[PDB]
Amino acid sequence: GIWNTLLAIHKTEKAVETPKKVFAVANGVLYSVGKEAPHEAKIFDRISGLSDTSVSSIAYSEQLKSLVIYYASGNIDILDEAGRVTNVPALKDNIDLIDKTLNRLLIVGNRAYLAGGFGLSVLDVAEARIPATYAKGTKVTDVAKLDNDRLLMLKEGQLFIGKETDNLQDPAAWTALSLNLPMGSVTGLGIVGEDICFLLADGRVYVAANQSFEPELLLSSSADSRLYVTDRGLFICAENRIYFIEKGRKTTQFPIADVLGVGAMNESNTAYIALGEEGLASLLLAEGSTAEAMPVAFDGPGDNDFYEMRFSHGRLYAASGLWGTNLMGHAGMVKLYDGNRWTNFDKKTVQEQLGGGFSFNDAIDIAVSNGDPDHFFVGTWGNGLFEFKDGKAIARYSGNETAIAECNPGDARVKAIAFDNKGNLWGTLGAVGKNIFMYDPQSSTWHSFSYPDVANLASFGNMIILPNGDKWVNILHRSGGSTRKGVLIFNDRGTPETTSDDSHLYVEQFVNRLGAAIGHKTIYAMAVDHNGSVWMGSDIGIFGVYNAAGVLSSTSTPIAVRPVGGEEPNLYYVLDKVTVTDIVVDKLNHKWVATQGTGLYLLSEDCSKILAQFTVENSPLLSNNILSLALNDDNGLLYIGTADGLMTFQTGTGSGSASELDGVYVYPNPLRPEYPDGVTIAGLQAGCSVKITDTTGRLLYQTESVTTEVKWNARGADGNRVASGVYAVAVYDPVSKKSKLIRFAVIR
Ligand SMILES: C[As](C)(=O)[O-]
Ligand SMILES: [Ca+2]
Ligand SMILES: [Ca+2]
Ligand SMILES: [Ca+2]
Ligand SMILES: [Ca+2]
Ligand SMILES: [Cl-]
Ligand SMILES: [Zn+2]
Ligand SMILES: [Zn+2]
Ligand SMILES: [Zn+2]
Ligand SMILES: [Zn+2]
Ligand SMILES: [Zn+2]
Ligand SMILES: [Zn+2]
Ligand SMILES: [Zn+2]
Ligand SMILES: [Zn+2]
């Protein structure tokens, strides 16, 4: 399939027991795990039939053999036994309901009670509809169902009782309960047999017979303990131990630390635990039992953070770490994808491999060597330069003896790192004098310099090194209140030890043909196309400098061309005021443009015409806010680093030699009068000639392949559908000199 998601499991924050499966949530990703049988588990995304992206909680209806999926966006999905999804978007669509936070997802029979920042919602699981919302727009701390259709609600430190047979959408229908306990301190409540338990913020746990509600202290857990409600019992998870409360107030203690969720069915003797950063584990509910670990065979990225990505030597290189003026503390993470499996270098791994006092945080740029895929460098914003070699971190460069200059004692912020054609590492440093540096990995020699016009600026962006040796670096920040963010082009002229022979041009602001400013505030992305043009993206859109190699030699300020699109009477600049985060260039010299808030665009050679655009609305794209791009020129897979994780789109730009056109097909075949939209040519390769002819041979439609698909309205010039018969699709790729003749029928 054309779209795919490369999502992370990692921190299991929730767990639910199913008669034959164990559903669990890790960072918003829902997934299944087999019980008695050795796994046969499953990962569930929007591609699997789900209606939304980040899972906020789950619960199972033993009676309806269905799972309720509640999303961070307020959306609801019902996963039936057959694996059929039913959407319940009433909460998400309610604009007035501004807080979607969920506190309790209680499933009683064939009803689900959702208590959150929106109120208390009654979900009809069998019929996917919400017949009522009590306390609408008020945070409801918890919910509990009792005998004789009675419902218990904890809101604003008050406990209310109400009969479901009355109009509980009316405040007068509920009765406020005065109980001997500090109700304002109650963080959770749940029913266990003939009792109701109340957990207090200070750790205490109160128990009360459901027929009297007279509270007495059951146990004294540690402060800020968590309560997990289950049909089998209640779990009081304190720091270092759990309290399992069951019928008749039997309490069992277990030394299980950092527990985020528990799953157990009414008649189960084993509970499934969510240990977060560890994952899943099963526990036999008996005094002398240990939580036996659950296996996670799923391999994915370390996290879903793709701040910066690069594609080299048939591998993806990604940096998760965050950038800002002082937006630090994000755990360091380097992710490498083989095309099948992941390799993750996290904060702890790197610190152990190198040893000592440094923090390995905010990894923000990658630089891969030419010829050695396992030899790459990583720039951390605050912790220095890192050398990776043969699957381990072999060195950390920061401070004295190194050219990695520190802006503060122990603070070296490294961004815009790249390698030259000669195998040297060029890079820039933030908030220091000798800004620009070079490292010879072979001779292990260092050289740093700067140009007064660019020296001591807060932060640079990314570096592109043109074939003639020119180095382009974008300016992300000078200082607090400075608009002097441009681009610096420079050539060291083979001697990184001197500036005396260098050529450089600092272009604070670019101009058009008429000598006016473009108007860009910041340059976020830069790309060299096949026509020797440096296409750059900014806060006000995209624009390219033609013959970029001659800028240092030219006798004028470089001219930037803002692409012009649309028909002759109605023209415009291709995406004005749209913040462009990344640019990648096709085998066809077409441009893949990532934007902050308006999805993904595919533009023509000169960026004049939009060839395609993908958003959350029109495509399986996870988020309209894309942070990075990377393209596998060999199999045509474009990696899309969205704010909500990694995705891949088959561009059809692949260098797949044999059987490349063996996959072309038309659907629907035959084309019946009840199918109005027309036909779709699929399994193509971008850049292909596609022509439709009658059995005679006269062409009726002709195009080039944009993506993997081409569409035909299947009608004549008169707008009425084309006559019955056998039509033919001739596909020719100019590159391989091979053709594909496929036929489809139009029937009465
Ligand atoms: C591993 As190679 C020498 O083909 O870049
Ligand atoms: Ca050398
Ligand atoms: Ca020089
Ligand atoms: Ca989102
Ligand atoms: Ca080809
Ligand atoms: Cl029903
Ligand atoms: Zn119903
Ligand atoms: Zn993160
Ligand atoms: Zn990048
Ligand atoms: Zn290689
Ligand atoms: Zn190597
Ligand atoms: Zn040297
Ligand atoms: Zn200068
Ligand atoms: Zn084109």
Residue 322 lies in a domain: yes
Token pair 């004692």 is at which residue?
Answer: 409
Q: Which ligand is nearest to the CA of 487?
A: 13
Among 313, 317, 368, 419, the mutation site with the greatest number of ligand 1 atoms within 8 A of its Cβ is 313
Residue 262 lies in a domain: no
To which H or E segment does residue 403 belong? none
From the CA of 115, how far away is ligand 12's center (Å)? 66
Residue 715 lies in a domain: yes
How would you list the strands of the sheet with 66-71, edge to edge?
A: 55-61, 66-71, 76-79, 85-88
First to last CA, the chain: 32
Other beta carbons within 10 angstroms of residue 83's beta carbon come to 12
> What residue type is 104 in one-letter code?
R
From the CA of 424, how far away is ligand 10's center (Å)? 17
From the CA of 641, how far away is ligand 4's center (Å)? 13
Write the CB contacts of 617 (distance below 8 Å, at least 6 apart in sequence).
none
Residues with C-beta atoms within 5 A of ion ligand 13: 451, 453, 506
Residue 111 lies in a domain: no
Strands (E), 327-470: 333-337, 342-346, 363-368, 376-382, 384-389, 392-397, 412-419, 425-429, 436-440, 445-449, 459-465
Helix, strand, coil percent values for the chain (each to nearest 5): 5, 45, 50
Residue 689 lies in a domain: yes
Please give the Cα distance from 213 to 196 (Å, whole number). Answer: 8
- CB half-sphere exposure, 123, CA atoms < 13 A: 32
CB 393 within 8 A of CB 405: no
Other beta carbons within 10 angstroms of residue 481's beta carbon come to 5
Please give the Cα distance from 652 to 587 (Å, whole number). Answer: 10
To which H or E segment does residue 93 belong? helix 90-93
CA separation (Å) from 562 to 231, 513, 575? Answer: 63, 10, 10
Q: Which ligand is nearest to the CA of 636?
A: 5
Q: What is the experimental resolution, given in Å to one decimal place?
A: 2.9
CA separation (Å) from 271 to 263, 291, 688? Answer: 6, 9, 57
Please give the Cα distance from 2 to 648 (Å, whole number). Answer: 8
Strands (E), 38-118: 42-44, 55-61, 66-71, 76-79, 85-88, 102-108, 111-116
Residues in binding site for Ca(2+) = 440, 492, 495, 498, 501-502, 644, 660, 733
Residue 551 has φ and ψ, to the nearest 5°, of -60, -45
Token pair 């004049």 is at which residue?
Answer: 608
Among the atoms of ligand 1, which is closest to the Cα of residue 313? 5
CA separation (Å) from 477 to 179, 182, 362? Answer: 59, 52, 17
Token pair 């406990």 is at which residue?
Answer: 159
Q: Which long-range CB contacts under 8 A does 114-121 form with residues at least 24 apart?
A: 114/70, 115/140, 115/141, 115/142, 115/143, 115/153, 115/154, 116/140, 118/74, 118/91, 118/94, 120/153, 120/155, 121/91
Biggest CA pair distance of the chain: 92
**665-667 vs 679-682, strand pairing mode:** antiparallel
Token pair 């899943």 is at which residue?
Answer: 280
With a 6 Å cutoff on the Cβ, whether 374 touches ligand 1 is no
Q: Which residues in 520-556 are b (16+ Cβ under 10 Å) and which e?
A: bebbbbbbbbeeebbbbbbbbbbbbbeebeebbeeee
With a 6 Å cutoff on the Cβ, whether 312 touches ligand 1 is no
CB 484 within 8 A of CB 508: yes
From the CA of 530, how far away is ligand 5's center (Å)? 18
Among candidate residues 350, 371, 397, the one where a domain is terminated: 397
Q: For residue 646, what is the DSSP state?
A: E
Among candidates 298, 333, 418, which has minimal Cα distance to 33? 298
Residue 686 lies in a domain: yes
| Six token digits for residue 56 | 């906020």
Q: Which ligand is nearest to the CA of 588?
A: 14
Please give the Cα distance from 118 to 487 (Å, whole number). Answer: 48
Please give the Cα distance from 23 to 429 (Å, whole number). Answer: 46
CA separation (Å) from 598 to 153, 251, 348, 521, 543? Answer: 42, 54, 36, 19, 17
Write the CB contacts of 43 (distance below 8 Å, at least 6 apart in sequence).
7, 9, 29, 30, 31, 32, 298
Task: Write the burial class of residue 347 (CB in 10 Å: 0-12 exposed, 13-18 middle, 19+ buried).
Answer: middle
| Six token digits for residue 698 | 């006269």
Q: Which ligand is nearest to the CA of 446?
A: 12
CB 177 within 8 A of CB 159: yes
Please give the Cα distance from 290 to 257 (Å, whole number). Answer: 12
From the CA of 404, how far away is ligand 2's center (Å)? 19
| Six token digits for residue 416 | 């815009």
Rg of the Cα trace of the chain?
Answer: 31
From the CA of 315, how far away is ligand 10's center (Å)? 9
With a 6 Å cutoff on the Cβ, whether 371 touches ligand 1 is yes
Among candidate residues 351, 379, 397, the one where a domain is terminated: 397
Among 370, 372, 419, the mutation site with the greatest number of ligand 1 atoms within 8 A of its Cβ is 372
Q: After which residues does a break in the chain occur, C–N more than 2.5 Å?
A: none
Residue 334 has φ and ψ, to the nearest 5°, of -120, 130
Please give the Cα distance from 198 to 96 (Å, whole number). Answer: 31
Task: Please name the residue whose Cα sits nearest to atom 4 of ligand 1.
Answer: 371
Among the atoms of ligand 1, which is closest to the Cα of residue 371? 5
Separation of CA 575 from chain center: 24
Strands (E), 255-350: 261-263, 270-274, 280-284, 292-293, 308-312, 315-319, 333-337, 342-346
**Region of residue 56 (left: phi > 0; alpha: psi -120 to 50; beta: else):** alpha
Q: Is the peptide bond prior to 19 cis by the omega test (within 30 degrees of 0)?
A: no
Give the three-state DSSP class for 6: strand
CB 8 within 8 A of CB 300: yes
Please give the Cα distance from 503 to 512 (Å, whole number). Answer: 23
Q: For residue 326, what is the DSSP state?
A: S
Q: Which ligand is nearest to the CA of 643?
A: 4
Among candidates 420, 424, 400, 395, which has minimal Cα distance to 412? 400
Please give the Cα distance from 124 to 675 (Å, whole number). Answer: 35
Other beta carbons within 10 angstroms of residue 220's beta carbon come to 12
CB 366 within 8 A of CB 310: yes
CB 427 within 8 A of CB 418: yes
With a 6 Å cutoff on the Cβ, whether 313 touches ligand 1 is yes
With a 6 Å cutoff on the Cβ, whether 34 touches ligand 1 is no
Please give the Cα distance from 321 to 345 (Å, whole number). Answer: 12
From the CA of 462, how far away is ligand 9's center (Å)? 7
Task: Please name the residue whose Cα sits nearest to atom 3 of ligand 1.
Answer: 371
Number of domains composing the chain:
2
**Residue-range definition of the domain harbouring residue 706:** 665-746
Give the three-state DSSP class for 185: helix
Residues with C-beta atoms within 5 A of ion ligand 12: 445
Other beta carbons within 10 angstroms of residue 718's beta carbon come to 7
| Six token digits for residue 404 | 């990695």
With a 6 Å cutoff on the Cβ, whether 373 touches ligand 1 is yes
With a 6 Å cutoff on the Cβ, whether 38 touches ligand 1 is no
CB 413 within 8 A of CB 382: yes
Please give the Cα distance from 507 to 536 (Å, whole number). Answer: 13
Please give the Cα distance from 29 to 722 (Å, whole number). Answer: 47
Write the CB contacts of 101 (distance below 8 Å, at least 6 apart in sequence).
116, 117, 139
Task: Please name the residue whose Cα sits nearest to atom 2 of ligand 1.
Answer: 371
> What residue type is 80 in one-letter code?
D
Residues in binding site for Zn(2+) = 124, 127, 305, 308, 313, 330, 372, 374, 389-390, 447, 453, 504, 582, 590
| Six token digits for residue 592 | 């893949």
CB 602 within 8 A of CB 548: no
Please give the Cα distance from 406 to 384 (Å, whole number). Answer: 8
Residues paired with 70 in a beta bridge:
57, 76
Write the CB contacts of 229 (distance below 8 Å, at least 6 apart in sequence).
104, 106, 188, 190, 191
Residues paired with 645 in a beta bridge:
642
Residue 494 lies in a domain: no
Other beta carbons within 10 angstroms of residue 480's beta carbon come to 7
From the CA of 312, how far away is ligand 10's center (Å)? 7
**270-274 vs 261-263, strand pairing mode:** antiparallel
Give the three-state DSSP class for 351: helix
Among candidate residues 377, 397, 417, the one where a domain is terminated: 397
Q: For residue 254, what is the DSSP state?
A: E
CB 303 within 8 A of CB 293: no
Residues with C-beta atoms within 5 A of ion ligand 6: 126
> What residue type is 690 in one-letter code?
V
With a 6 Å cutoff on the Cβ, whether 248 touches ligand 1 is no
CA separation (Å) from 58 to 23, 61, 142, 514? Answer: 8, 10, 16, 60
Residues in binding site = 124, 127, 305, 308, 313, 330, 372, 374, 389-390, 440, 447, 453, 492, 495, 498, 501-502, 504, 582, 590, 644, 660, 733
With a 6 Å cutoff on the Cβ, whether 150 touches ligand 1 is no
Q: Which residues in 692-706 are b (16+ Cβ under 10 Å) and which e?
A: bbeeeeeebbeeebb
- Cα angle, residue 178 at apex, residues 172 and 184 outer, rounded to 5°: 95
From the CA of 60, how far away is ligand 4's center (Å)? 25
Residue 122 lies in a domain: no
Task: Write the burial class of residue 176 (CB in 10 Å: 0-12 exposed, 13-18 middle, 19+ buried).
Answer: exposed
CB 521 within 8 A of CB 542: no
| Six token digits for residue 354 | 């190198």
Give the three-state DSSP class for 384: strand
From the CA of 83, how far away is ligand 5's center (Å)? 39
- Cα angle, residue 470 at apex, residues 465 and 474 outer, rounded to 5°: 65
Please give the Cα distance from 340 to 725 (Å, whole number). Answer: 45
With a 6 Å cutoff on the Cβ, whether 255 touches ligand 1 is no
CB 381 within 8 A of CB 413: yes
Write the CB contacts of 505 (distance below 8 Å, at least 6 apart in sequence).
488, 489, 490, 551, 552, 558
**102-108 vs 85-88, strand pairing mode:** unpaired
Domain harbouring 701, CATH code:
2.60.40.3580
CB 381 within 8 A of CB 476: no
Among candidates 279, 317, 273, which has minimal Cα distance to 298? 279
| Six token digits for residue 126 | 């069998």
Q: Which ligand is nearest to the CA of 454?
A: 13
Task: Please name the residue whose Cα sits nearest to atom 5 of ligand 1.
Answer: 371
Q: Which ligand is nearest to the CA of 444?
A: 2
CA separation (Å) from 362 to 43, 305, 385, 658? Answer: 29, 11, 11, 43
Q: For residue 172, what is the DSSP state?
A: G
Among the atoms of ligand 1, which is closest to the Cα of residue 370? 5
**Region of residue 119 (left: phi > 0; alpha: psi -120 to 50; beta: else):** left
Residues paired with 625 in a beta bridge:
596
From the CA of 551, how far away is ligand 3's center (Å)? 18
Q: For residue 455, what is the DSSP state?
A: T
**Region of residue 169 (left: phi > 0; alpha: psi -120 to 50; beta: else):** alpha
Among candidates 464, 465, 459, 584, which has minimal Cα distance to 522? 459
**487-491 vs 471-477, strand pairing mode:** antiparallel
From the CA of 71, how far away is ligand 7's center (Å)? 22
Q: For residue 383, what is the DSSP state?
A: B
From the CA of 452, how far away is ligand 13's center (Å)? 7
Among candidates 599, 613, 584, which has minimal Cα distance to 706? 613
CB 283 within 8 A of CB 298: no
Please give the Cα distance from 472 to 488 (Å, whole number). Answer: 6
Please give the Cα distance from 607 to 543 (Å, whole number). Answer: 8
